[PDB]
Amino acid sequence: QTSAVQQKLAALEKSSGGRLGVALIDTADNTQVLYRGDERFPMCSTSKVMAAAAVLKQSETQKQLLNQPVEIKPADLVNYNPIAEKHVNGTMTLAELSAAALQYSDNTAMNKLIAQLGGPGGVTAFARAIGDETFRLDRTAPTLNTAIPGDPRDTTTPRAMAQTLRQLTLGHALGETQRAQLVTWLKGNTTGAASIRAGLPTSWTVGDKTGSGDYGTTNDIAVIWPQGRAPLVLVTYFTQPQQNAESRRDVLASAARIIAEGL
Ligand SMILES: [K+]
Ligand SMILES: [Ru+3]
């Protein structure tokens, strides 16, 4: 079948010139709306949620872990380091690195999370441990954002990512304390107002993580507390044919608007 919402999402996609992937979980009824839900997309920095959550899981058996100093060296800086560059030749804790990675999309911070997990494969191992058989992290930042069409590296499907983000933020993949910390971090994101947020009514609350990369790749994954409604989890992933394509955060906003109007 093609549902009315799917038909609208297809029309949006047709007019964007790229490829759109959407997955909604409505926790009012534990149902799912999917558009290219089983196709792979490059995650770009949306993968930082999985890395931060894996460190939060480690902290369940190490109560001081998030206060653990990590040295930041000049060689650690990469292409986008708004927080970490201030701490070169000093230290940041794993809490600080998690907050920087999630709320500012600091790539040096993400790389410290990855290193704490033993490399990209450690992030994938955490995904598997929480029931996500689809996610894969293969590279550090920034090369995880190359977003080359057809490349399986650093990809997931909308279905899998929605289901993971539910489990992490609303379910029991993390302990109580850790889940609340993750939600606090996502709600404090600085980078999201033009993406899913921009398609929703003002009164709805959002916590999200954006991503972008080559091929005009423009992504957002969110938990949403609508006015008067049980929470939603929404993944919107968008990528384009030309390497140098311009971000399209408006397409994500439009997808979110269609989903909101279809509840
Ligand atoms: K880009
Ligand atoms: Ru159907």
Side-chain angles (χ1 to χ4, degrees), residues 2-263:
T2 305
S3 65
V5 168
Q6 289 169 327
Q7 181 180 232
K8 294 182 175 200
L9 294 169
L12 168 60
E13 182 183 58
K14 273 160 236 120
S15 294
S16 75
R19 184 169 66 100
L20 178 66
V22 182
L24 167 73
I25 296 168
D26 183 349
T27 76
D29 62 5
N30 286 350
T31 63
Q32 283 192 69
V33 171
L34 301 177
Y35 184 78
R36 303 194 187 287
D38 295 305
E39 299 189 16
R40 286 193 174 274
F41 291 79
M43 291 180 284
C44 299
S45 296
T46 69
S47 62
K48 296 179 183 175
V49 176
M50 193 72 81
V55 174
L56 283 169
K57 176 56 63 178
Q58 290 179 316
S59 79
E60 294 178 24
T61 51
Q62 296 185 260
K63 174 152 279 172
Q64 267 329 271
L65 183 60
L66 297 175
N67 294 336
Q68 188 170 300
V70 178
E71 295 185 341
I72 312 301
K73 293 279 176 254
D76 296 333
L77 296 191
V78 293
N79 64 315
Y80 191 68
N81 330 288
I83 309 309
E85 67 187 4
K86 295 188 306 195
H87 303 294
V88 163
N89 293 319
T91 66
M92 293 170 69
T93 71
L94 283 165
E96 288 180 284
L97 291 158
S98 296
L102 292 175
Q103 303 185 322
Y104 297 84
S105 215
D106 186 306
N107 282 340
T108 295
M110 169 59 153
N111 287 345
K112 295 302 188 178
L113 303 179
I114 295 171
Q116 168 59 25
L117 299 165
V123 186
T124 305
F126 173 71
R128 298 289 179 284
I130 67 165
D132 187 329
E133 282 293 327
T134 305
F135 176 100
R136 54 184 288 176
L137 198 72
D138 297 274
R139 290 169 293 167
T140 64
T143 65
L144 69 82
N145 304 287
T146 51
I148 297 159
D151 187 351
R153 292 175 295 169
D154 310 296
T155 63
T156 196
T157 67
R159 186 198 293 269
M161 190 68 242
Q163 297 176 170
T164 287
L165 188 61
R166 187 263 192 169
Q167 294 287 55
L168 292 174
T169 61
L170 299 173
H172 296 282
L174 300 175
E176 168 150 334
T177 291
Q178 290 75 30
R179 170 180 74 178
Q181 178 68 85
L182 180 60
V183 169
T184 295
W185 282 330
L186 293 169
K187 285 184 170 188
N189 183 30
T190 71
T191 68
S195 302
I196 286 168
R197 167 77 271 182
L200 301 177
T202 306
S203 59
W204 296 21
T205 285
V206 177
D208 78 301
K209 179 72 194 82
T210 53
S212 42
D214 263 355
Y215 296 87
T217 297
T218 313
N219 296 336
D220 199 17
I221 70 175
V223 189
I224 301 162
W225 296 263
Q227 179 179 91
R229 317 289 189 269
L232 313 175
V233 174
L234 181 61
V235 166
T236 59
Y237 279 168
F238 182 69
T239 192
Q240 299 176 74
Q242 289 279 339
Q243 184 182 3
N244 70 356
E246 317 256 356
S247 294
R248 295 294 306 263
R249 299 183 174 77
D250 65 303
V251 170
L252 308 187
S254 291
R257 187 178 299 110
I258 288 161
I259 288 288
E261 287 185 353
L263 294 180

